[PDB]
Every structure is written in structure tokens, then in C-alpha cells.
Design a binder for these strands. Structure first.
Lengths: 169, 434, 106, 73, 162, 83, 82, 80
RNA sequence: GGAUUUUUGGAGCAGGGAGAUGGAAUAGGAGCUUGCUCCGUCCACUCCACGCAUCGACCUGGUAUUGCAGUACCUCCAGGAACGGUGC
């Protein structure tokens, strides 16, 4: 799963109506970040659950990591990143870290989405010499730290876990 | 919690700054009448700021009456001194300065750059309390008064002249009833005049003046204010006379005068007071009402162009001899021809000569600087901005092609014999591996 | 220095409780094992000490807030206009005096 | 002058709401570009559950508030 | 950094996810709360997240207030006269603030339309009988902090604090 | 000529509108076919007549002399009218 | 002069013909001046029928409403241009 | 000769229009057109059993206006 | 270019009865202030036909769902009605 603006939340009360539900979700997600839109239906296809669109993937991730199992309408609901992009966003330590145990089958596109999850990095270099290795540099060292702490033990193609460490001098 | 000292110091600083700002405003001048009215309200406001500080200071004696015992000791001291130091021995490492201890009330009770505004004084003015026909003290608010006089009278034999001749008198004969709703209408009109007088005079002691006027209505008008020789005295609101002062005083304690009529001394006191306020404002601003009457007369009789405007408030080239050059020379030089330079702010040039020079002439140099595209040869004779952009893009691509970037081409094989560019080469070189 | 300003204010508050030029709340505290070099007369901070003292005197005098209340300032547009014109008039006198001094220097 | 798009609604059973709270069910057969209608077997039910059919009525577009067609036509 | 009218005029006022007319303050850090009148009553929600707001007071006279977002705050205490300026204000997103005392929400009873509030991660939330004092002193609120008020807890909140 | 609000209602044709007529009638449903005479033949509408019971019916036809208002899709905020 | 085009693009509270209101940023206009209100608010009266209960004005979300010339009566200007 | 130009020959003169919605608006109307289309500018309007509301830019309709009241010192011969 | 689909308009009208029930700090006229009596504008409770029926949220419990979606309003019982407005 990747960082998206929409933060999904499931297992809210179904005895709570959709209007007050989206009201309370907006209230609890304004403290997390910029609530831009709210996708909440009351039909059994998405009943009892709702996805609130943050104007930041950092904001939706903040809400998902702060409110994991959050006491919400009678029973703590579970919040995480949306599976894909929402309609709203759809219409919308070092400089470099070395990635190890990387798949020699991995795709550059998914690799770029992952390295740019934290604000867009400089590049990723999947080494065509010594296989199963990368060297990725960031346009921001703060994003570098964030993505590297997230990536130490990163899960992509779970057949392996790829790790990002502070690349030496 | 030292109230004897801290309150006095704060009030003293605030009041010094307030008096200084007011004295500066009254020692300088404002050039406009709008400046004059805004500054007069501001001077009343500075006096009210000084007054609020003084009202907070003159009551803070509930701690002083008992602190005169505690601060009057010459036996204690350095013990409490060292204790205050033991508290003041917290970290003060906020290594920086800020003057916000004694220099603030200057920018609290001072003036502004383009219009005289302090910190609080940014929105204080006669803007919401001034009429356009008024001018911040030149005309009055009486057009609605005339409309209401019409809607009350129901006659077409009442104009500005009759309205002024009726509404100027203080105690002159009414043309409209003080026993009918005409009294309430006059009360409302004199209320508008009193609002003009209350917005025009913020430097007069309004509380004392209103108290003196209430004392006047309670003492000198109800105590025979219009002397005479039945004919001794009559009532302004009652419409009843007295055989003498004795008859007046004995009939003011009579039965029909107290409550035995709709025009008695209890149900008609407000109407008498409104008539009094109206007549008093008229007779005080007779020079203001006289200026308004002269205004009305001139604005009603003057010409329309000046009246509306007062209510609202060949081309040949120039030769070397400062003369216009011949028409045939003009035709030859093709100056009549207009060339639009959009990048130059939709500028227009005459003459293809000037037009061609214009690309190295300054205004186009700027236009292209603003665009972010260097005024180089390649863009000369391009004028539309979208075109300049697109061309700049393809030229970016061109120079990018012909340039030599080692970072991207220079291909490096690793010890494992497979190729990287030198960028990744040095990357994973110092990144512990290559 | 906010702490230094507060300390100078405290020194002025202690000098408002001084009884003589020698016997007050600063004398012993000068040598009482704590740092106080602000009583020295040459350091520019003595000016802040003295100005705090002048304000402490103008606020600790009888009308400064000790046992009486002055209301011609707290409710007085008449006194306000008087004192404001008087400050402007002292300003005008000083303007004429500075002009005289400049002419004499010329 | 525009004619309406009533050629599909022609020959359809329509329950229309006319002004005064009236409910008339009838058959559209041919209309005038002003929507000036003639309704076959037009049954205009009063406020109560009592209704009557009147056959041929030139109804108003000033009084017709809206109309619905119960078939897909 | 003084709170001013530029940080009001450059703000966003729109119809947000909850169909409320919200004025938003992204990145404000304003520790001075005043002068919101020129909001012009085209708004019902007032969000001022990322603010250094030390106190809960200082708001002007609006008739149609619907939501108040004091999210990510630094409030020390709360001012009282919020009710005459918020006649029918109902939602208060007031978590992440330094509320402790049972008297830190004493002005809350003046809210007539109060329906929902969130004051989480505050030293006042963790206390026993805290939701009791909540559902007592805000008698109008039927849900607070993502859980409705109930007849049994309301009876207990009446019994206690007597 | 042709009015741009009417052009926005044309851009909202086919899709769902939420109109309100003279009698408070709130019809929320697909407004299919319409004219410059504001005579719109619509379908799939929940017509309530302002009484609270909206009924889900087909092939309604609402004029415009009664038309109090009509909500048209927000996604037309980029319609060529306003820009 | 087609005057409205100078005050358009900014938010006005228009009236209905039945005493209600429609507050929004006026988008575009026509001959008959039937209005196009974007993200419109419909602030109407609620029948009090009592002196012991207040008088409230509730507004629902209309969005982009194309209000007919039978609703456009008088429209004050109340909002900044969004 | 319809009253079109009698209504339209007016700009920013203190007049009093009566809207057929039981309301009155007095002030300096901005400009009038041929079909009784007049705007309001800084106008004070009193509604049916209501308050003296102020309008900075209000757009008064034509047939929803019930009457007009001109100035008192205006020659109707020179106006119509 | 005011005769059925947008601006020379079909708008405006007033809130069901009654009882030795109450109120008009500041506003009623008469019996030529107060004390008392009458009458033409509401609300609060109580009586009748709680104005009724309909439905849309809504307050309480109990009750099912764990459900990846660009939205009139969505599980169900029951109520007491705090609301919107329709037919008389």
C-alpha cells in the first residue's frame, strides 16, 4: 500500500447516520490535516465505512498512524491509506540511501512511486551490475529520513524485505 | 502582584503617550475637512483612552489603603530582595532584543503615514458617520426630514423655503401640530440634527453638556423660561396658560395637568423634550442651518453641469526644430503604421524602424525578463508571448541536445563488468560498495 | 535583556522605598554576594535605573496612586485639551528658542 | 417559434399535476408548440379519492405544473 | 507574528466536505483571536488549525456559526462569553489543547445548540467522571468525542457532582 | 439569443438535477430532455411535491413557469460559461 | 450597460419570490437574468406560529442552482469574490 | 410612448421604489434600462413587517416592483 | 417583443371555539390619576377535533452489517414529537 490523500476508515457505527458520520470524520480529520472532501455512502457497498480525502498524503498518513483503532461511534474504527487515489486527488541520515534485498524483478514505476511517497526524491538507481540493490537520492533530506526510516524493512513483493540505510561516505 | 507600582507605571506610560499624541495632533494641522472630522473624533478618542487609563487608576486604592502598611517598612528588605532574586534566577537565555516595553504606546496613540491612524486608530473616522451632501460638516441630513414632512402634511404647498421657515424657529409659531404626530416627527428630525451635532463635536464635554441640558429642561423651562406681561406665562408642551406664576404653579399641581389629558406633564414630557432639543439645535446651528439654507438655495437654482459636477465632488512627428515634419516625409517614413508589442505591455510603436529597434529597446528587454526568456537574437521579431514561450522550449531542447552532460552519457562499467553512468558509479562508489 | 529589564525595574521599586541617599534596599544588596553592576553611575544602565526611579516617584507621590484618585485626567476632555495645547505650546516655545540659538550660532 | 419535444410523449399514459393541486391522468395525442394539449380519456381526480374522466379537454400550460409518463413510450 | 486582516482576506471560504460554509486558516500560528466580523456571515465554520492560540476567547458577533475548529491548539484557559457571539454553534473540534480542570469547560453550558465535541489527547480527558461532568454540564450535547451520550451515563452524571 | 444559465442547464441535461417548482415540488432525478422554453422532460426522479414523501417515478415533465429553482451538477463549474 | 457583469463573480444574497434567499457567487447571466448560483445557500424562513418559540432561518445546500426569473427579485452583495 | 424612457432616464438620484414584494427601497439607484430594469446602490429597504435593511449592491426586478417615487423638485415634463 | 414556459405579476387577505385561568416593569380610551369595571392585537398551561393524515431527518434503547466508493435519503421495532411542508 502507498501514501494517498484519501484515508479510509472502516468499522464505524452503522447506527450512526451518514451526515453526522461525515461531520465527525471531518472534525477528527481537521486536527490531522486539510479535510478537502469526504466520500461516505450509506449503502451496503460502503455502509458503516468512509474515506476522507486529505489535501496531503502526509496528513492522511498522520491520521492513520495517530488514530489506528480509534474510539469512534461506539466501536474503535480502523484507519489506513486508501487502496488507490481518491477522486479529489485524482482531479488534483543522508541525501542518498542504499536499498538492499531489492527485487531484480521490481518495476521502476512502483519504485519511483515508493521513493517519491516522501516528497519527490532526486532519483533511484537500480544497479544493473550487482543485482538486487539500489541507490536513491532525495530532493529533501527530511523526506529522505522519513522514507528511510519507513523503508528499513520495506515490504514490496513480500517475497523479500528491502531495507534502506544511511549510505556511507 | 504589586498594584501600587505596576498599575501606576503602566497607566503613566499610556497616559504620557496619549497626551503626547493628542498634543501633537492639535499642534499640527489636517489639510482636509475629512482629516479634520476624523482627527476631531480621534482627539476625543485619545482623551477617552486617557480617561480609561485614569478610571482604572483612580479606583485602584483597595490595595493601596492596606499596602501603605506593607511598603512603609524600613526594617525588612534584602531578605525579600534575595527571594525575588531566587525566583528571577530562571533561564533568560532568549538571547535577543525587543523594545516592546516603553516604545509601544507611541504607535498606540500616534499618527499614520497616509491617514492619521494609530494602532487602534486605523478605522476611526467620519467614514460611517458622514453624509455626502454633508461633507463632514458642510451640509446636513435633512432630505429625509423633508420627505417625512411631506408624508405627514399631505400638501403640495410645502417646499424647501417653507420647511426652513418652519424648522428654523426655536419657539416660533408651529405650522404643524405639536399636539399630533408632528411632535414625534419633529423629535425624530431634531434627533437627526442632534446626531449631526454629536458627530461634529467630539471635543465638547458631552456628559456634562447633556446633564446641564437635562437640568435646564428640569429647571428653567418648567420655571417660567418665557417671561411676559393669562399673559404672564403659558406652557410650551401643555398648551395651557396661567393667571400668573402662582396660577401656573397651582395648575401644574392641579388634577387635569398631571394625568387628566393626553398632553399632560407625564405623558408629554418626551414630546416637550424632543421639541426642545430640535429648537435648541436649530437655534444653535443657525449659522450651520444658514450655511445649509444657502447651500440648498444655490444647489436648487444653479446650473446643471456645475451642479452635478459639484455633487460629484494633426499629430505629426516632432521634428528636430520642435516642429511637425512634412506630411509627405511622414508618408515616406511609414509612421502611420502601428506595430503592437504585446510583451511590452501591449505597447504600440510607429514606424518599422522603431519597431525593429524595439527588441533591444528597454521595455521589451523587461517584458522578456519578466517572461523568463533572455532578450537574445533568436526571439527578435517574435511578439506574442505564447510563441516566445514555445520557441524558448524548442531552443531549450536544442541547446540541451548539443550540450555535453557527462553525468548522463559517460558510461562506466563496474568491477562486475556491467555498465553504469558515472553518476551512479560515484554514488555506489562512496555508498560503501563500488 | 528581558530579565535585565525586570531586574532594573525591581531596583527602581526598591529605590522608591529608599529613605535616604544611603539607607535603602540597594545598599547591602550591592555587596551581598549577588551580581549588581547597575548601581554604578557610568554604565549606561544607570540611566534606566534613574528613569525607572523617576517614574516610580511620579507614580508613588500622593497623586501617583498612593491614597487619592485624580479624575480630571480619567474623565476630563477639558483637562485633556488644556494639557495637549500646553504641550504644543511648550513645543512652540522650544521651536522659537532653537531658532534663536541657530541664528546666534550663525 | 419552437415546438416541444412532445412527439415521444405522444400516445402515452401520463399522470400530470396541474395547478390547484389537480391530478389528471390522460393520453397525449398531439400538441401545439405552446404545449397547448388535448388529452384523451383525461381523468382529473379531485382532492379526494373521487375522480372523473372527461374525454376531450384542451388543458392549459399555465395551469399544468408538471407531467409524468408511466410508460417508457 | 500578529494575527491580522491579510491572513483573513487571503483565507479560503467555501462549501467544505460537510456542506458548511467554512473559512480556513492553513498555517496561521495566530496567538491573537479577534476581528473576524468581515467574514461577512457567508461562513458558518471557522477553522484555525496550526495556531499558537493560548486562550479560547475573543470572537465577534455572528448569527449562523456552525463549526469551530481549534484543532492542533495550545489553549491554556477558556473565555466565557462565547454564547452571545455563537448563538447556535454546535461542533467544537478542540483536542490537542492544555485543558485539565473541571472548570476549563464551565463556559460550555452557554452553548445552546452544542451537539458534538472532541477534546482528545488533553490532560482533562483521562480523568474519571470526566465524561460524567461533560454530559452533565453540557446538557444539550448528545455526542462528544466520537461516542453518544446515554441515559445510564447521564443518570450517573446527574447523581455525581452534587 | 441564448442564455448561459440555460446553456448550463443544457450541460446538466441527461444527468441528474434537483429542481423545485411553483408548488414547492422538489424533483430530484435525471433531467433528460429540455427546451429553451424551460420545459424539461426528465426521468428517474424522486418527486416529493414538498410534502416529504418523495416518490421514485419515471418520465416526468416539469415546465419552467413554475420553476422556483434547479440544482445542476457542480462538476459544471468548469463549464465554458464562467471559466 | 448590462450592469450585472460588473458585480458578477462575487457573492451576493439574492431573494426568492417567496421571501427566502439564495447566497452565492453569481456565475453567468441571460436576457431574462435568471441567475446561476454556484455552491448556493438557500436561507429560508421557518414558520414560527408561536411567540414562545424563536424564529430561525435554516439554509440547505443547493450547489449550482439555476434560479428562474420567477425567483430573481432583489439581490444584495454580501460576499468577497471567490 | 411607453414609460420605458421615463423610468430609464434616471441615475443616482434619491428616489423611492416600491417592490411588489411588499418592500420599499430608497436611495440613489445606479442605472435603469428600457424594460424597468433598475439596480440599487447603497439603498435602504424596508420589507413587509421587517427591518430597515441596507443593500450595497441589490438588483431590483421589473414587474416585482410595484411603483416608483421620483424626487419632489423634478419636472416630470422634462423627465418623461 | 404586457394574452399559456421566466420581469407591466393571481396577488392579497386573516389564523378553529370557549371557561368566576394570568401578564402588558415602560403604552391603551371610558367611567374626568390610585382602588374597581368594559372592550376591539398573543402567549403559557387545561377543555374540544393534543388541528388531523402522510412522509423526510430527529431522541432513546435493543437490533444487523465488516461491507473498497464517488452520493437525493438507506437495516429494522417502538415511541414520544424538538422540526419542513403538502390535501381540508
Amino acid at each position: 500500500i502507498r501514501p494517498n490523500h484519501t484515508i479510509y476508515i472502516n468499522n464505524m457505527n452503522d447506527k450512526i447516520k451518514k451526515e453526522e458520520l461525515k461531520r465527525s470524520l471531518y472534525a477528527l480529520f481537521s486536527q490531522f490535516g486539510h479535510v478537502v472532501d469526504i466520500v461516505a455512502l450509506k449503502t451496503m457497498k460502503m455502509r458503516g465505512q468512509a474515506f476522507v480525502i486529505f489535501k496531503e498524503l502526509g496528513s492522511s498518513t498522520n491520521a492513520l498512524r495517530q488514530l489506528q483503532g480509534f474510539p469512534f461511534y461506539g466501536k474503535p474504527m480502523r484507519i489506513q491509506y486508501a487502496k488507490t487515489d481518491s477522486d479529489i486527488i485524482s482531479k488534483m541520515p543522508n541525501y542518498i540511501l542504499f536499498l538492499n534485498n531489492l527485487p531484480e524483478e521490481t518495476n521502476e514505476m512502483m519504485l519511483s512511486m515508493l521513493f517519491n511517497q516522501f516528497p519527490g526524491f532526486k532519483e533511484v538507481r537500480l544497479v544493473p551490475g550487482r543485482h538486487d540493490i539500489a541507490f536513491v537520492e532525495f530532493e529533501n533530506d527530511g523526506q529522505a529520513g522519513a522514507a528511510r526510516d519507513a523503508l528499513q524493512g520495506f515490504k514490496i513483493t513480500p517475497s523479500h524485505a528491502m531495507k534502506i540505510t544511511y549510505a556511507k561516505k | 502582584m504589586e498594584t501600587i507600582l505596576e498599575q501606576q507605571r503602566r497607566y503613566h506610560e499610556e497616559k504620557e503617550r496619549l497626551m503626547d499624541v493628542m498634543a501633537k495632533e492639535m499642534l499640527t494641522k489636517k489639510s482636509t475637512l475629512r482629516d479634520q472630522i476624523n482627527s476631531d473624533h480621534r482627539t476625543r478618542a485619545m482623551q477617552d483612552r486617557y480617561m480609561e487609563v485614569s478610571g482604572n487608576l483612580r479606583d485602584l486604592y483597595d490595595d493601596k489603603d492596606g499596602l501603605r502598611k506593607e511598603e512603609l517598612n524600613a526594617i525588612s528588605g534584602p531578605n525579600e530582595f534575595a527571594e525575588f532574586y531566587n525566583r528571577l534566577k530562571q533561564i533568560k537565555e532568549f538571547h535577543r532584543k525587543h523594545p516592546n516595553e516603553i516604545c509601544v504606546p507611541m504607535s498606540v496613540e500616534f499618527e499614520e503615514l497616509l491617514k492619521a491612524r494609530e494602532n487602534p486608530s486605523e478605522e476611526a473616522q467620519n467614514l460611517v458617520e458622514f453624509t455626502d451632501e454633508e461633507g463632514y460638516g458642510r451640509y446636513l441630513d435633512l432630505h429625509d426630514c423633508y420627505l417625512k414632512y411631506i408624508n405627514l402634511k399631505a400638501s403640495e404647498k410645502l417646499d424647501y423655503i417653507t420647511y426652513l421657515s418652519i424648522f428654523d424657529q426655536l419657539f416660533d409659531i408651529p405650522k404643524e401640530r405639536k399636539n399630533a404626530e408632528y411632535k414625534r416627527y419633529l423629535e425624530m428630525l431634531l434627533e437627526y440634527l442632534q446626531d449631526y451635532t454629536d458627530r461634529v463635536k467630539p471635543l465638547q464635554d458631552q456628559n456634562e453638556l447633556f446633564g446641564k441640558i437635562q437640568a435646564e429642561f428640569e429647571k428653567k423651562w418648567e420655571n417660567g423660561t418665557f417671561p411676559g406681561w393669562e399673559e404672564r406665562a403659558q406652557r410650551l408642551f401643555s398648551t395651557k396658560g396661567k393667571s400668573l406664576e402662582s396660577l401656573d404653579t397651582s395648575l401644574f399641581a392641579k388634577n387635569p395637568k398631571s394625568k387628566g389629558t393626553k398632553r399632560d406633564t407625564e405623558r408629554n414630557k418626551d414630546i416637550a423634550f424632543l421639541e426642545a432639543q430640535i429648537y435648541e439645535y436649530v437655534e444653535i446651528l443657525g449659522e450651520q442651518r444658514h450655511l445649509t439654507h444657502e447651500n440648498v438655495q444655490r444647489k436648487q437654482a444653479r446650473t446643471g453641469e456645475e451642479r452635478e459636477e459639484e455633487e460629484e465632488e494633426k499629430n505629426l512627428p516632432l521634428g528636430w526644430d520642435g516642429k511637425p515634419i512634412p506630411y509627405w516625409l511622414y508618408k515616406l517614413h511609414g509612421l502611420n503604421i502601428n506595430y503592437n508589442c504585446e510583451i511590452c505591455g501591449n505597447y504600440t510603436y510607429r514606424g518599422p524602424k522603431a519597431f525593429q529597434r524595439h527588441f533591444a529597446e528597454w521595455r521589451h528587454a523587461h517584458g522578456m525578463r519578466c517572461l523568463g526568456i533572455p532578450n537574445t537574437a533568436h526571439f527578435a521579431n517574435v511578439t506574442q508571448i505564447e510563441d516566445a514561450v514555445s520557441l524558448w522550449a524548442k531552443l531549450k531542447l536544442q541547446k540541451a541536445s548539443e550540450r555535453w552532460q557527462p553525468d548522463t552519457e559517460e558510461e562506466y562499467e563496474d568491477s562486475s563488468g556491467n555498465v553504469v553512468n558515472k553518476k551512479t558509479y560515484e554514488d555506489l562508489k562512496r555508498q560503501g560498495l563500488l | 535583556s528581558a530579565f535585565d529589564l525586570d531586574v532594573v525595574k525591581l531596583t527602581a521599586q526598591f529605590v522608591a522605598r529608599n529613605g535616604r541617599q544611603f539607607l535603602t534596599q540597594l545598599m547591602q544588596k550591592e555587596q551581598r554576594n549577588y551580581q549588581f553592576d547597575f548601581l554604578r553611575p557610568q554604565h549606561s544602565l544607570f540611566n534606566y535605573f534613574t528613569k525607572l526611579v523617576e517614574q516610580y516617584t511620579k507614580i508613588l507621590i500622593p497623586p501617583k496612586g498612593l491614597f487619592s484618585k485624580l479624575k480630571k485626567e480619567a474623565e476630563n476632555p477639558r483637562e485633556v485639551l488644556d494639557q495637549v495645547c500646553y504641550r504644543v505650546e511648550w513645543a512652540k516655545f522650544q521651536e522659537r528658542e532653537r531658532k534663536k540659538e541657530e541664528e546666534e550660532k550663525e | 417559434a419552437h415546438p416541444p419535444e412532445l412527439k415521444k410523449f405522444m400516445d402515452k399514459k401520463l399522470s400530470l399535476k396541474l395547478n390547484g393541486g389537480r391530478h389528471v391522468q390522460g393520453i397525449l395525442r398531439g400538441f401545439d408548440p405552446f404545449m397547448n394539449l388535448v388529452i384523451d380519456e383525461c381523468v382529473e381526480m379531485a382532492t379526494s379519492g373521487q375522480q372523473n374522466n372527461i374525454g376531450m379537454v384542451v388543458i392549459r400550460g399555465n395551469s399544468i405544473i408538471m407531467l409524468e409518463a408511466l410508460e417508457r413510450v | 507574528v500578529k494575527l491580522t486582516a491579510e491572513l483573513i482576506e487571503q483565507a479560503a471560504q467555501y462549501t467544505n466536505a460537510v456542506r458548511d460554509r467554512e473559512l480556513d486558516l492553513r498555517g496561521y500560528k495566530i496567538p491573537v483571536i479577534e476581528n473576524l466580523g468581515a467574514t461577512l456571515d457567508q461562513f458558518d465554520a471557522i477553522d484555525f488549525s496550526d495556531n499558537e492560540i493560548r486562550k479560547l476567547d475573543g470572537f465577534p458577533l455572528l448569527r449562523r456559526l456552525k463549526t469551530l475548529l481549534v484543532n492542533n491548539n495550545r489553549i491554556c484557559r477558556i473565555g466565557e462569553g462565547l454564547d452571545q457571539a455563537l448563538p447556535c454553534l454546535t461542533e467544537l473540534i478542540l483536542t490537542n489543547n492544555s485543558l485539565v480542570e473541571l472548570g476549563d469547560l464551565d463556559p460550555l453550558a452557554s452553548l445552546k445548540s452544542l451537539t458534538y465535541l472532541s477534546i482528545l489527547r488533553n490532560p482533562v480527558t483521562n480523568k474519571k467522571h470526566y465524561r460524567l461532568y461533560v454530559i452533565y454540564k453540557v446538557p444539550q450535547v448528545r455526542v462528544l468525542d466520537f461516542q453518544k451520550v446515554k441515559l445510564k451515563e447521564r443518570q450517573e452524571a446527574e447523581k455525581m457532582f452534587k | 439569443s441564448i442564455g448561459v444559465p440555460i446553456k448550463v442547464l443544457h450541460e446538466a441535461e441527461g444527468h441528474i438535477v434537483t429542481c423545485e417548482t411553483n408548488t414547492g415540488e422538489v424533483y430530484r432525478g435525471k433531467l433528460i430532455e429540455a427546451e429553451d422554453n424551460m420545459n424539461c422532460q426528465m426521468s428517474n426522479i424522486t418527486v416529493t411535491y414538498r410534502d416529504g414523501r418523495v416518490a421514485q417515478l419515471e418520465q416526468v415533465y416539469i415546465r419552467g413557469s413554475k420553476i422556483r429553482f434547479l440544482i445542476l451538477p457542480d462538476m459544471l463549474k468548469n463549464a465554458p460559461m464562467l471559466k | 450597460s448590462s450592469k450585472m457583469l460588473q458585480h458578477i463573480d462575487y457573492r451576493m444574497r439574492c431573494i426568492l419570490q417567496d421571501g427566502r434567499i439564495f447566497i452565492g457567487t453569481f456565475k453567468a447571466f441571460d436576457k431574462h437574468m435568471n441567475l446561476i448560483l454556484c455552491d448556493c445557500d438557500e436561507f429560508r424562513k421557518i414558520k414560527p406560529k408561536n411567540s414562545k418559540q424563536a424564529e430561525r432561518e435554516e439554509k440547505r445546500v443547493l450547489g449550482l442552482v439555476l434560479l428562474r426569473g420567477e425567483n430573481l427579485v432583489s439581490m444584495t452583495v454580501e460576499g468577497p469574490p471567490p | 410612448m411607453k414609460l420605458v424612457r421615463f423610468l430609464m432616464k434616471l441615475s443616482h438620484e434619491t428616489v423611492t421604489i416600491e417592490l411588489k414584494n411588499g418592500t420599499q427601497v430608497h436611495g440613489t439607484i445606479t442605472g435603469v434600462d428600457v424594460s424597468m430594469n433598475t439596480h440599487l446602490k447603497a439603498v435602504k429597504m424596508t420589507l413587509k413587517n421587517r427591518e430597515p435593511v441596507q443593500l450595497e449592491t441589490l438588483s431590483i426586478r421589473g414587474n416585482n416592483i410595484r411603483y416608483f417615487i421620483l424626487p419632489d423638485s423634478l419636472p416630470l415634463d422634462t423627465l418623461l
